[PDB]
Structure 1
């Protein structure tokens, strides 16, 4: 499936990853994951392997082979994997979650011995890699965000709102752009700058962008650094234009009959193409495709029986 960009991958509480065609709705293949649920999916820069974050393990699958074996399954962690990220050369992998550490694997080794790990004193909700630079941004349940220098172990501590946890972060490919969200209804945008020094600085506050959606669960930027999308536990998703952070549009799955409302949470989204489509997950048991430019709908994928949370796809081949 790695060879054809049309294939989208979804996962949820059915203990399987399903691969289907974005523009036809035809299901093409499945991968079994009976050991646990999947917390996150990701595709390597090599466009030929997909990772899945499960319970007490991180597992790799071959996206070209017809025998999706656990290629180099990293059996460890012992509690939870919040997310899995990859470095751009395909050499390193980054993990958050529990125990409260940011652990980095040197993926070519067959051992789980790591060359670096950062101790954090609350569970880690998200880990991001700075574009084109060996630095991590780690979001914790304590409300703190830490920046770690992968080359020196130096760091910076950011605690903009100690009362609430950080729930998600994503740093735009454009090194000057944000962002992260917390559990109480607001997104923060600070200017990215810095220089040479021991402390891994500097962020300079720019604007506070309220959502008023009780969360959010996921913050994500488009490939063209133009759009910012936010998904929450509520039945909506909002998209702002980064040139001024004004609201451009809004997506919603709310029921038209309140008696059957709150069918499920919008567990994240992803941009596809040059800001052409949004691939959305939903706990109500299907995936949906939306157009960012018009709001035109709808394509659906309902191969699952239980709630669907994770998204991944071959955006480029």
Structure 2
């Protein structure tokens, strides 16, 4: 009925606002990125700092894991992405081609492609093996806030400040669907649901919306949190109860019942905007991260 997430750890070390946290697919690690130009790796279960990965020339807005938990990709204001070997900490490839800040990134499930979005208003698809850009998509008319592959990597969803969410065919780079809203608020985040049938989109009017993109039908809206300014991550929690999880500009983590849309828990502890949250792949664990008055990551655990 309701989860009971409780604070287990506070992870300090970043020296500027944290931007993104992601659990490894194997559940062992959390990676974080920051405006401080660093990636840090932490133990998912004991919160123990593992290592710092450095090399970007400017701040990092996003980080993502490969399926074998062996590679990370990061998206930086330095206009590049970097692919890293997590075990050695070494930069394997630098992905060059965007003409402005790279804001978001993700591997496909196969882990042979990376998708990125940029302030340059494009979405790029990259070959992991060669580090070469395969496709540049003239995707949006304003900064691209999020990019995400579906369950089998055949589709990409992108969101933008231009007010659109778009679905793309990975192989051809073609736009298959545009989702619109008459009042046209900036879209600050999007991702596919775990089954790939829906997308969850955040807009800067304090609203999260679950869409059946095929039908162009909005099925659920989640409200009551604060999101008017930042590109805050949201998540489907599937390990126990079925929840939607998001950060908020009132310094809380919000958790909603997926079906009823009721807020079922608010997690208190951060002292600045909660810009990023992540849900552990097998356990009822949430990671949350906050902006520069706080600069910490918190790990929370629930029984359901």
The answer, yes or no, to whether TM exceeds 0.5 is: yes
The Cα of 1:283 is off from its aligned counterpart by 0.9
Partner of 1:132: 110
Is residue 277–residue 291 contact of structure 1 (8 Å, CA) maintained in 2?
Answer: yes
2:93 counterpart (98, 116, 119): 116
Q: Closer, same or farther in 2 for the Cα pair 1:207/1:294, shift >3 Å?
A: same
Report the Cα offset of residue 245 of structure 1. 3.1
TM-aligned CA deviation for residue 36 of structure 1 = 2.0
Tell whether the 8 Å contact from 1:264 to 1:284 is kept in structure 2 after alignment: no
The separation in 2 between residues aligned to 1:94 and 1:190, in whole angstroms, is 21
Bigger CA radius of gyration = 1
- Residues 1:160 and 2:126 are matched in the alignment: no
- Alignment deviations for residues 51-84 of structure 1 (CA, whole Å, 9 cap, x no partner): 1112121111122336x22x22113313111111
Taking the aligned partners of 1:93 and 1:241, their CA distance within structure 2 comes to 30
Q: Which has the higher strand share?
A: 2
Aligned equivalent of 2:65: 86
1:250 aligned partner: 221
Equivalences for 1:163-174 in 2 at 5 Å? 163-174=141-152
Assess, with a 3 A threshold, how the Cα gap between structure 1 residues 175 and 269 changes in structure 2: closer, same or farther.
same
The answer to whether the 8 Å contact 1:232/1:267 transfers is no
CA distance in 1, matches of 2:14, 2:157: 34
Aligned residue pair count: 277
Matched, 1:239 2:210: yes
What's the TM-score once normalised by structure 2's chain length?
0.83
Give 1:225 shift.
Answer: 1.3
**Which residue pairs with 1:60 in the alignment?**
41
Change (3 A) 1:61 1:160: closer
Question: Deviation above 4 Å: which 4+ runs of structure 1?
Answer: 261-266
Map 1:168-247; keep pairs closer than 5 Å.
168-192=146-170, 194=171, 202-211=172-181, 212-247=183-218
TM-score by length of 1: 0.80
Measured on the aligned residues, the alpha-carbon RMSD in Å equals 2.3
Higher RCO, 1 or 2 (CA under 8 Å, sep at least 6)? 2
Gaps of 5+ in 1: 1-21, 195-201, 255-260
